[PDB]
Design a protein around this ligand. Structure first.
Ligand SMILES: *C(=N)[C@H](C[C@@H]1CCNC1=O)NC(=O)[C@@H]1[C@@H]2[C@H](CN1C(=O)[C@@H](NC(=O)C(F)(F)F)C(C)(C)C)C2(C)C
Ligand SMILES: *C(=N)[C@H](C[C@@H]1CCNC1=O)NC(=O)[C@@H]1[C@@H]2[C@H](CN1C(=O)[C@@H](NC(=O)C(F)(F)F)C(C)(C)C)C2(C)C
Lengths: 306, 306
């Protein structure tokens, strides 16, 4: 029993982290096969960040201007190209620790593990969720760019995030591994702010199922509700609408615990209207929305990875 | 910026996890050099758990009765011995991925990362703390025994925990890597319950410093207090006494933020007496006590590991 914010094992991703240095700027890079992926603002000075012309700055750079270090070994760069907001540095050595991997673009509300790195070395791992406003609540400092977010399916590492910058209130924004930003953000040091965030409703319900699986059941009421009636209440308290797709994904947890999704919705409706009255669910005094239905099943049934 | 429950990178520990099978019981084992460490109740049937005579059960077993699998490769066992509540299985092959490591016994209040494993394969990683009642609030299922807790100092992995069993209310107990249980618990399926837990005061103060570093400063009051006056208030609300040693460890965070430890104690005294009045600190509606002063410095300054 027990329920904790569990991150994926980071070993496969650790064997891919390298250090990329251009001029005096240093950040992290991802070494898969014979290509290194890193944020494109490695070619920027501190003054270049206010208004960078990345196409102009990359012109003036050659292969030998990129210092790539994998541990105590320098990787010779033999080619470079820019795909949206990431650089692709072709090196003469393929990474022998390259795992089976994919490049995926996740949806808002989906979770992944972040391996925070500095100078190409891992500092820690934590679980995050793509917020509906296309930010993440992470923990990044200077030089953390290049750290990646990933999911693991059996032996395959699905890379879905690369850190680029921090937004006001201490939230973070980045791109997929193709350089495309999550949200309407740009890699430029200018005034940018995230949109108003909302609560991931399908993740709250899955976290309530995890509580019932663990015997924390005080919040279960005796009622049911209609998907429409629940969504009207959810709209008031800044909760995302619960679609029929979300109901289908919650099927396994509903069948395991014997509680219909609409019955758990009626229980959530009361919590939104009355609060928790000084009680906790799974030790938390607030409703949690960074566990997907798959995170609950994977943790409560002990799914392992090759 | 940002502050999250960060776990250590698990890569070094993943290369040490093996699967140990004896009869029909299967659990996890730690493979360091040419020795496999696993909980001793692997030699137990389900009926042997109510009253096991481990010395008697191990007599009846030989080296070939232990099936050790590292991936798809079986490790030949050439010797075995029991040290308190763990088995030491000597194998004919040294683990080539053995990291620089130590066996340490941590104190209550100190933190570490747990790599939850099943059948020798990692399922996830999370950060925990040794509670003052010598339990941990983890997430373990059937077959999770053998999963280890560890700290990483540069390139050295300090193993400090091995999971053995779950206690009422869903808390967990285990041993150090020498087989010695944390707390007055025994590896027997009989009525056992943890003592009443308390809040790790030095970890709460360090987590308040992390909030001030991150700009969350509404709780800072204008007062100071004496170590004695604070400890009387802390004793009322089931908080551990703050020793002078704890004050010295909080030195770096106090010098970084310019807030004396006794001033932060006066701020904590008001929070304990008035509550938080519907406000959050670092997004949490409750005071957090599973971040050591070192976890705060390591996260807020980005300490990496080799
Ligand atoms: C990469 N190493 C850093 C990681 C940052 C540093 C502090 N916390 C993080 O996550 N990324 C940057 O420094 C990026 C980058 C220039 C500036 N930047 C920012 O994150 C800035 N934010 C913004 O400008 C805003 F608000 F628009 F998002 C900063 C003010 C330093 C937080 C470039 C090239 C955009
Ligand atoms: C190792 N694979 C399991 C992990 C357990 C299983 C459920 N959650 C966990 O952490 N360890 C055990 O099954 C141990 C073990 C026998 C029984 N046991 C227990 O954890 C039991 N707890 C107790 O008996 C109590 F309350 F005294 F701690 C159980 C009732 C199954 C939770 C042995 C040899 C002690």
């Amino acid at each position: 029993s027990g329920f904790r914010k569990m991150a994926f094992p980071s070993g496969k991703v650790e064997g891919c982290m390298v250090q990329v240095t251009c001029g005096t700027t240093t950040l992290n890079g991802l070494w898969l096969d014979d290509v290194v992926y890193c944020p494109r603002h490695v070619i920027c000075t501190s003054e270049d960040m206010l208004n960078p012309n990345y196409e102009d700055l990359l012109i003036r750079k050659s292969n030998h201007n990129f210092l790539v270090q994998a541990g105590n070994v320098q990787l010779r760069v033999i080619g470079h190209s820019m795909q949206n907001c990431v650089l692709k540095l072709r090196v003469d050595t393929a990474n022998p620790k390259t795992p089976k991997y994919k490049f995926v673009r996740i949806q808002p509300g989906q979770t992944f593990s972040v391996l925070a790195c500095y100078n190409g070395s891992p500092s820690g791992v934590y679980q995050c969720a793509m917020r509906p406003n296309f930010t993440i609540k992470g923990s990044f400092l200077n030089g953390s760019c290049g750290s990646v977010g990933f999911n693991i399916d059996y032996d395959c590492v699905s890379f879905c995030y690369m850190h680029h910058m921090e937004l006001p209130t201490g939230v973070h924004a980045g791109t997929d591994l193709e350089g495309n930003f999550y949200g309407p953000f740009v890699d430029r040091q200018t005034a940018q702010a995230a949109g108003t965030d909302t609560t991931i409703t399908v993740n709250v319900l899955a976290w309530l199922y995890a509580a019932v699986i663990n015997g924390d059941r005080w919040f279960l009421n005796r009622f049911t509700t209609t998907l429409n009636d629940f969504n009207l209440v959810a709209m008031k308290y800044n909760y995302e609408p619960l679609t029929q797709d979300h109901v289908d994904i919650l099927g396994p947890l509903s069948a395991q615990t014997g509680i219909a999704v609409l019955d758990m919705c009626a229980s959530l409706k009361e919590l939104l209207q009355n609060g928790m009255n000084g009680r906790t669910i799974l030790g938390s005094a607030l409703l949690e929305d960074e566990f997907t239905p798959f995170d609950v099943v994977r943790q409560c049934s002990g799914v392992t990875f090759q």
